[PDB]
Every structure is written in C-alpha cells, then in structure tokens.
Write a protein that binds this ligand. Structure first.
Ligand SMILES: *SCCS(=O)(=O)O
Ligand SMILES: *SCCS(=O)(=O)O
Length: 107
C-alpha cells in the first residue's frame, strides 16, 4: 500500500526497527551494532525500503515522521533514534542497553 502504511505497520512499541537500503555502509554498521545485542528474536527488524520499488515515497514519509529522509532510520519502539551516529552515541554511553531493558526487548 502507501508509504505511510509500509512504515507505520513496522514501527511498534517494544520493537527495534531500522529502515535500510542496499549499498549503504552506515546501514550495515547500524545492523552490526544491533545484531551484537541479545535482543529477542522477532524484536529486531531491518526493513529494506527499496524492495517494493517505492524508495522515494518511503523516504518522503520518513522525513515527515522523523525530520530526516536518510537511512538508516533507527526506531526503538516509536522513538526515532535517528541515524547511525545517533545509534553509536547511545551504544557507547550505555543508554542503548538501558532503553532496551526498559522496553523489555532483551531475549
Ligand atoms: S499494518 C500491518 C499490515 S500486515 O503486515 O499484517 O499485512
Ligand atoms: S555510525 C555512522 C558513522 S560515525 O558518524 O559514527 O562515524
């Protein structure tokens, strides 16, 4: 369906969702950071925004929803973390782990 549906359907409280595209070094780094962690299977999802041939529309909606159109676009539940640098900052400070504990996402 619509870009809004594609995105909103995926974002869920308690779940880590990262919108990505192919050929995206920062997407791969975001994936590495999050895949290291003991997040429960099913509560981490990487979403290829190009797979339905509506890349631009999806980025347009991400821009509307979050203020930026770029991937990776990282969500912890409904919270938009932002991009890769944002995620790195949280990982390093320990805030990523604390947030995952609070929302019950660990295995
Ligand atoms: S909003 C979720 C739609 S679906 O994935 O069940 O098809
Ligand atoms: S994670 C994106 C690369 S960097 O800004 O953290 O150097």
């Amino acid at each position: 369906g619509t870009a809004q549906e594609f995105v909103n359907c995926k974002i869920q409280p308690g779940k880590v969702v990262v919108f990505i595209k192919p050929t995206c070094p920062y997407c791969r780094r975001a994936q590495e950071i999050l895949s290291q962690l003991p997040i429960k299977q099913g509560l981490l999802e990487f979403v290829d925004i190009t797979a339905t041939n509506h890349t631009n529309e999806i980025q347009d909606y991400l821009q509307q929803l979050t203020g930026a159109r770029t991937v990776p676009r990282v969500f912890i539940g409904k919270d938009c973390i932002g991009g890769c640098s944002d995620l790195v900052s949280l990982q390093q400070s320990g805030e990523l782990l604390t947030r995952l504990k609070q929302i019950g996402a660990l295995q």
